[PDB]
Design goal:
Main location (chain G): cytoplasm
Largest interface: D-H, 36 and 42 residues
Shape of chain D: globular
Number of helices of chain H: 6
Strand content of chain H: 15-25%
Order of helices and strands of chain H: HEEEEHHEEEEHHEEH
CATH class of chain H: Alpha Beta
Shape of chain H: globular
Number of strands of chain D: 10
Modified residues (Phosphoserine) (chain G): 48
CATH superfamily of chain H: Aminohydrolase, N-terminal nucleophile (Ntn) domain
CATH superfamily of chain D: Aminohydrolase, N-terminal nucleophile (Ntn) domain
Chains: A alpha+beta, B alpha+beta, C alpha+beta, D alpha+beta, E alpha+beta, F alpha+beta, G alpha+beta, H alpha+beta
Pfam families (chain G): Proteasome (PF00227), Proteasome_A_N (PF10584)
Oligomer: part of a larger assembly
CATH architecture of chain D: 4-Layer Sandwich
Number of domains of chain H: 1
CATH class of chain D: Alpha Beta
Strand order of the largest sheet of chain H: 8-1-2-9-10
Bound molecules: the ligand *[C@@](C)(CO)[C@](*)(O)[C@H](Cc1ccccc1)NC(=O)[C@H](Cc1ccc(OC)cc1)NC(=O)[C@@H](C)NC(=O)C1=CC2=CCC=CC2=C1C, magnesium ion
Structural class of chain H: alpha+beta
Subcellular location (chain G): Cytoplasm; Nucleus
Number of domains of chain D: 1
Order of helices and strands of chain D: HEEEEHHEEEEHHEEH
Radius of gyration of chain H: 18 Å
Modified residues (Phosphothreonine) (chain G): 47
Strand order of the largest sheet of chain D: 8-1-2-9-10
Radius of gyration of chain D: 18 Å
Amino acid sequence: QFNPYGDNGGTILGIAGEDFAVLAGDTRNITDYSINSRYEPKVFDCGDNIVMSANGFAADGDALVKRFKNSVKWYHFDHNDKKLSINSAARNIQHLLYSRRFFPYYVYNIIAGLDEDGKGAVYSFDPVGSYQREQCRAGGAAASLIMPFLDNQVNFKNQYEPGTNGKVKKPLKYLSVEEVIKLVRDSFTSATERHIQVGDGLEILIVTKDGVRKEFYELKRD
Amino acid sequence: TQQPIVTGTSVISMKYDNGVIIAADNLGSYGSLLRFNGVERLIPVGDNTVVGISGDISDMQHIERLLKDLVTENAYDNPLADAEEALEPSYIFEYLATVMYQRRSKMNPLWNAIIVAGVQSNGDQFLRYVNLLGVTYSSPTLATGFGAHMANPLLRKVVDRESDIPKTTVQVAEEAIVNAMRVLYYRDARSSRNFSLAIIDKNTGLTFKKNLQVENMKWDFAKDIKGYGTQKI
Amino acid sequence: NNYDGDTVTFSPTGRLFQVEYALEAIKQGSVTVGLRSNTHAVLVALKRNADELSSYQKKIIKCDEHMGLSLAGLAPDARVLSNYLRQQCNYSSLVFNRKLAVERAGHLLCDKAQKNTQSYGGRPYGVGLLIIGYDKSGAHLLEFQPSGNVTELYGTAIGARSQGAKTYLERTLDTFIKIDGNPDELIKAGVEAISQSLRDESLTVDNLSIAIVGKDTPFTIYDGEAVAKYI
Amino acid sequence: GYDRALSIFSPDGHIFQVEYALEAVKRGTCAVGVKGKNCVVLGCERRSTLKLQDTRITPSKVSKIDSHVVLSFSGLNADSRILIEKARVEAQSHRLTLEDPVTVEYLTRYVAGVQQRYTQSGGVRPFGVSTLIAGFDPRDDEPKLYQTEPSGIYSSWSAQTIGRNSKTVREFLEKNYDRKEPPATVEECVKLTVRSLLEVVQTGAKNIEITVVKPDSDIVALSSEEINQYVTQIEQEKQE
Amino acid sequence: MDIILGIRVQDSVILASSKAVTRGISVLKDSDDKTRQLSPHTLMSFAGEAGDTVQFAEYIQANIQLYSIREDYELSPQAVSSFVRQELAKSIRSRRPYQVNVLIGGYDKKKNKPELYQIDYLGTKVELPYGAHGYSGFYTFSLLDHHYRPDMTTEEGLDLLKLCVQELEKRMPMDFKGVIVKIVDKDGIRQVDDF
Amino acid sequence: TTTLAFKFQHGVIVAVDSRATAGSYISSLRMNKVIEINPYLLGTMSGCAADCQYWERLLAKECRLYYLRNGERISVSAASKLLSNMMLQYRGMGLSMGSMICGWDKKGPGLYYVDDNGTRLSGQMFSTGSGNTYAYGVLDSNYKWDLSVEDALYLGKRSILAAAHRDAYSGGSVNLYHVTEDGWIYHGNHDVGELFWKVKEEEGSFNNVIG
Amino acid sequence: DRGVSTFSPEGRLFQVEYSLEAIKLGSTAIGIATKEGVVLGVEKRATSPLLESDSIEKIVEIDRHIGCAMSGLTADARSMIEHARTAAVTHNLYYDEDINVESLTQSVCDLALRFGELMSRPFGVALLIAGHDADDGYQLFHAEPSGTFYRYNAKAIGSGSEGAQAELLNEWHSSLTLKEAELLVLKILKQVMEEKLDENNAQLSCITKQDGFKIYDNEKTAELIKELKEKEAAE
Amino acid sequence: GSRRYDSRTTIFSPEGRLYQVEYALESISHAGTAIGIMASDGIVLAAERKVTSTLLEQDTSTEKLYKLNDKIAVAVAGLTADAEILINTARIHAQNYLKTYNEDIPVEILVRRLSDIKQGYTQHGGLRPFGVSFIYAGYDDRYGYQLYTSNPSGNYTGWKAISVGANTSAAQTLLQMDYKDDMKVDDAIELALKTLSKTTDSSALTYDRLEFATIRKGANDGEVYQKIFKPQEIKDILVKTGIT
Ligand SMILES: *[C@@](C)(CO)[C@](*)(O)[C@H](Cc1ccccc1)NC(=O)[C@H](Cc1ccc(OC)cc1)NC(=O)[C@@H](C)NC(=O)C1=CC2=CCC=CC2=C1C
Ligand SMILES: [Mg+2]
């Protein structure tokens, strides 16, 4: 029997800063125990200061991104070159996913950018179209490895202030872009060690009011 | 939904400094029966692209006809059909990738794994893979079926990453490909000695080699091997 | 006379009057000028208002990053045809990862318009279009007539009093074709060309509409204080 | 399918087919609607050219759309059945999807929409019918009376008449009906409705039909003798 | 849903229907009315797959109400039951059949007779003095076979109905949360508020 | 999940948890399981998250169109029915949705349960999701019509807490809402970790747990 | 006879031109755009005194930020309004935002030329679409059955249109207040109307960023009429 | 195109009349007269065959009176072929009703259905209307004995006595004169034949130029019987009433 779905592995991570946002993902593409590519870009600049990554089944991931990029283009045509806000893009993507409720895009989608007040924004989706705005989200193969670490090191969960012994929590101080990138690199380095589908390379897209910047880092190739 | 009947095995390929190389054997298998021994699975499109196909042969012949019709259609009302508005490897690949993904989305796939190798207008090397699921990826080396398991490891020792491409000559790349085809003949039960090889270079153009054979094979050591453990005679 | 009731009827001299009447709608429309060099292609359009309280009807429409047109005649028909071009440009990109050739875009518009001239019930398009673009074979300018006839030109003009601008371009042919790597000078030649079609009224800030596309220049439209530079 | 555009504009900006449909309404028997303080009355003319008629089984001029709404008309009789059927289906469809009966305004808006649709659809002619739609909204004691016409426009009326010689009875209603103080009782409302028809009808025998609609789905049709008593009292006061 | 009973006495029809609605392992409601008035003198109770029951009942209700308005006339219980049967017989060979069983209790004003019709989801119609759907009949029919007379009063019908419910409450493993009882007679439809 | 909603003297309370799971993995610690359809209408979410969001946001479109056509707010009864009819179109196609439509209209406060099967039930008190049994236990024993707004908000909050504790697939935080005739009122996000320890001490409950 | 989509020798669609004549017979509707809001006003024109004038609904809400006035064959407007309301709310569903006034107007105008031998004829009604969005601010559009729409600072449609438009030519300036615009609509309506203007046979409305689209009460309009009379008598 | 040849069958005249319906009625006025008379104990249907021949096989012939079901019959005036199309539709409708409700279709419901079909041809489709006028004679347990008529406009009305076809003006005057409410079937039979005998365009009214039928409760106990008269039976009733 023909199985229309497949698993291309990979892992993605989105973090929302105070006035910035990052969307990172490894560049390894796989089937079963083989490597297809050590560098196959997975996070894309979709225009209007929005970045996007559809992780899971690559064919459905490429199709969704392609359709959203198209949706942005037609949004400009139909509404006098108006900028598509991150919340509007998020709602649009929900309807793209649910159009295939009975033959789903097999991907976990994340977008990142800035909201209309200039603050950092991350939105995360499920294959069938449920979405919500988040501060921190890891998706894909090693998502379960990374998320707990981010709960601890980004939101300071289970961390209290010395001397008080559990009475006073660690205060939720904001993180800089340099601090976030450190947590991203360590997350993927740790995921690479313990997950066979994670490795080869790490590509990070950083979004600010100035635009979209890229950063690349090598990962272990074994 | 179907099952593949008459099939073609591995297609292997790699980038080198001035272009790309692609190769595939000339066998059409019918299950375990080595039925057809004169099957060409590398199909040139113009003088800048070669499409290598594995999997179901009936679907390959269908794809072969789509490409032949694509060239015809591109020439219609096109004075620059043999120049600026000629078919590019990227155009040919994206067309196939669109077809493959649509067919899988109708639950009626073309049961193939395809590698499109070529050189673009600006001299850039093109090498991308697509299969029955519509899955696409690119790499300095690409291989289908058994080639993915046995050829890629050998070809990646020559071009391990992007920066190794300018350091790799056509002689070295061809040597690596030819060695890989020998290894596949040793170890793939659904392969043949006879194969075809194509080189697309940005300077010397398209060189298509037919009726190649695997040579310099090691078998002599077999005479000494006796029994399956304790037997001496 | 007796042969102008519908598009499906030839006259005794072999004329199609409904198509000719559709052509007449273009002549009533406001003037628009098109011209190109080897590096860039420019559209210049005189926008028309209903009265002093009203806005000035937009004349130029973007089809892709590398292609767009200007209209003269029934504006809704231009919206239909430009929408078709947007889809065709987009089909070429999504399927073939290929920017649509300007010449092929003209062939597609010709064929779409033709079907409306041979079938009963429908009507011809009542609009003329000037398509500019930059593709793999350089800069291009096309003139579309709703009869179906599409023509590739160095320069042209359509609309009311368009003969004046067309004569100017016919004299200036050897000059403006050589304006390579200079967008501002090519626009100047277009603004000077469209000025030959003006009577009574002159080019004001909310009257003039300009568009340009080129080698390292996406299709962009200039309106308002952005064209005050060229007045 | 037959797609021919029958309703089209003319050089002077008129749709003749819609206007000729109004002429069919002008030919139809007179219908009148009067709303009192706590009721609405629908009066209807029956032309006495047709005797030997079986009044038990002959289609009545006033039709119930639901238990709380009624519809009378003037114009082509066969055309009115199609509107009534559609209206009745929509009334049940509304109860089924929204769990409330239709308001009188909603039902009117639907019927008017059907009429409008037949003025710009291919292969069809407009309805040669104008309707008076009356009733009370669920859990409301304010009377409702609307009018529709072939073009598809509709509006609310304190009192209105349609059909042949409607110009005359409208003239009567305009001078007799006071907005500041409408017919306070059922008697006064029926009396005014009968009086208005007596300007046009001819004989006050079997030519006048009256239907009273009160709040909370209380709809009754008056008999010949009951109406005849109104006819008697009106003329006896007139002899002075 | 589960238990729906019906009994036709001298001058009326009595329908008893359970109040329970279950979803998963939780009883969401214990006061649900599994019935719809089709016309002033015709009542239909129903039981079957979740969602389908109410949708079918309301669809039937809408059709009968439409008929009543069109003709200014109430259809006989026999005519209504035949209409309902045809809709179910039409349904059983559809792509997705409506899994609904019904009892139709009506008083025929022409013949001055109560009438009870039992129709299952296949479109199997039978006129009966007393009836039930599902497992309800397994417990109750022996009592009804014994005690039922055709000249019973409405009060005697209710007493025999109480005995049936008591037997159900004793021998069923299922808690159906009591029943809502409704009477259909010459004066129309009314609910017995204390049972 | 665990959701609940109940009518009382001063309107209707709506309380939900915020956990989302993908198997045994907790995919989300804080997910909004309430939808604000209009100032006088709320909708709870249990089952497939996508199905809940899509169809209830589509209901809000249809409830909004009702206001424009009729110049009047839709009833809770009519809104719930529109939703149940949507579910009936995709009958047997595999949708998983369990919601309570809560609001105030002309008839007073309204509460309707609606699920993927098309079931539509009016009632005073409902609870949906994997932890509804735990919530019902607290609700049934402590509910009255004569509840004060303060005590009612606590009941719905405490009932979710009970479920979040025992049910593995319920937790995160508690989102409270109060519906009045002037509209709904949000009463905040309450972390269960912190709320548990607080309730334990103040109430004296959860004696078996050590803290 | 002749085709419905036929061109005249002058290059105009006969049917579109004839529908414009029907609009000239319609009751007057006026719109004035200011920086404090857009005002919409209409002539009700009851055919009889027994007709309850408050049921005449020629001003209509499309969304909270978009209003609409009509003139001509007003029955034809119902399907246009229905489409506009659907388009406005559907865009809010897809994009979680208010829709641009221009985009809404364009959606309505796309219906216009969908006629042939689709509907059998063009619409016989013109619309004044007024609204506000964050990008282009307060806007007023005039949507015709030709499929064309012009933006206007001020516009009058209907039977007294050319006389009213000439008056709007002189009176409108870029610094008009909302109160000044209200009185200006009432002034021009009173000028072109057959019957004497009052709160029962004329209706006002406006759209502001804060309060959105609002139809004015008869009590509120009555005061503005009384305020108009006194200021005209002041000189 | 094709528009050139379209007669436009479904349009209003400037006066607000439907051209084709009016012209269809003009056609029907030349058809053989058909009369229906309703009595307290039954209904009579009488109709005149148009200028027959001696070589026409009368006993197997049927051009006027048709049976829709056991309780309902119709008299035809106009194009016979058009009438048979509608008759077969009405026969099917009666059976559909019987299958659905397990009760015989009420007369009016059948009449309304046929009249609605006629109406449709005047409002949409671009086809010519049916050039037929019916007299429906029937019985049901709600209203008892009923007479209706329908015409190409799709409008229908109930009657105590009525005529369609030729000379209806003269025929209706004669019926209005002699008809009384307490009348019986045997008297109604006589009235129907006497009216035809005076209105006929033929020289004399004979058995071979007539079709006749009665619907009587004159069936054994509470039930209704349809009697389509045979040629010899029409000859006998003509002698009995004193016409021949
Ligand atoms: C209890 C958690 C049940 O265990 C609740 O019922 C909860 C309701 C709910 C959650 C969020 C929003 C609205 C309502 N139900 C679920 O979370 C639901 C349970 C479930 C799963 C699968 C099916 O069949 C398809 C039915 C019901 N869980 C989900 O829907 C899962 C699939 N969601 C995710 O896995 C998920 C991952 C994710 C990543 C980023 C953003 C959102 C994400 C979600 C919702
Ligand atoms: Mg690894």
